[PDB]
Write a protein that binds this ligand. Structure first.
Ligand SMILES: *[C@@H](N)N(C)N(C)C(=O)[C@H](Cc1ccccc1)NC(=O)OCc1ccccc1
Ligand SMILES: [Cl-]
Length: 217
């Protein structure tokens, strides 16, 4: 196909530093801003930390630290005509009243698109064509908690048990094992400096391609 065999948007400067969401159920907000940060770098050449807090406080269809959908975050940025920067709307790991200000607007959104349910070929073509893509996974296993290196594969991962939201920032192959390059929001001391390589084309391992989406900019 058109899509490269390997792409790593970290090497292209599309990916901001790894964040830590803390105990707040804001994985959906980190996943959403990571996809928007990628599109902002692609469309403008600038990499900026965007505000997950803006989403936690202001996306009324989501439950703040109580969880949320990435699609509701992209719909909010579009309807709201903006999202603020992290720097001036910082992450405080607790739900507060919405303090969105358009003077601090750092990005806009024109809606979102969904990858077809369970289609890893279509997720690869989207990551190649678009950039980083928001994904939901089964991150429930202790093997995931203690991940260090290599390509994560666990036969106990359940593609119908989506319980965490992360960001696919590329894909490739390592020691013969195809992978997705996944940015987590558990800080830089988790995983491989905050990243995990997750098995690719292993029958939608951990449900990586079951609820993937990206923003239009
Ligand atoms: C992350 N820290 N966190 C608590 N999670 C697991 C969520 O927020 C999940 C992420 C997710 C997204 C899509 C599919 C599967 C999992 N979202 C979630 O639990 O949404 C619940 C919700 C509550 C209120 C309004 C909308 C959704
Ligand atoms: Cl979602």
């Amino acid at each position: 196909g058109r899509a490269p065999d390997s792409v790593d948007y970290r090497k292209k400067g599309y990916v901001t530093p790894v964040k830590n969401q803390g105990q707040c159920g804001s994985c959906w907000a980190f996943s959403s801003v990571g996809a928007l940060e990628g599109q902002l770098k692609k469309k403008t050449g600038k990499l900026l930390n965007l505000s997950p807090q803006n989403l936690v406080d202001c996306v009324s269809e989501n439950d703040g630290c109580g969880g949320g959908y990435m699609t509701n975050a992209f719909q909010y940025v579009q309807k709201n005509r903006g999202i603020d920067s992290e720097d001036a709307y910082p992450y405080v790991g607790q739900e507060e009243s919405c303090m969105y200000n358009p003077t601090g607007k750092a990005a806009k959104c024109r809606g979102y698109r969904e990858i077809p349910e369970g289609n890893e070929k279509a997720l690869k073509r989207a990551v190649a064509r678009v950039g980083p893509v928001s994904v939901a996974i089964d991150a429930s296993l202790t093997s995931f908690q203690f991940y260090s290196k290599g390509v994560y594969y666990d036969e106990s991962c359940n593609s119908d048990n989506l319980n965490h939201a992360v960001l696919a920032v590329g894909y490739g192959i390592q020691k013969g094992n195809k992978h997705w390059i996944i940015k987590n929001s558990w800080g830089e001391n988790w995983g491989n400096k905050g990243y995990i390589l997750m098995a690719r084309n292993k029958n939608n391992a951990c449900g990586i391609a079951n609820l993937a989406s990206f923003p239009k900019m």
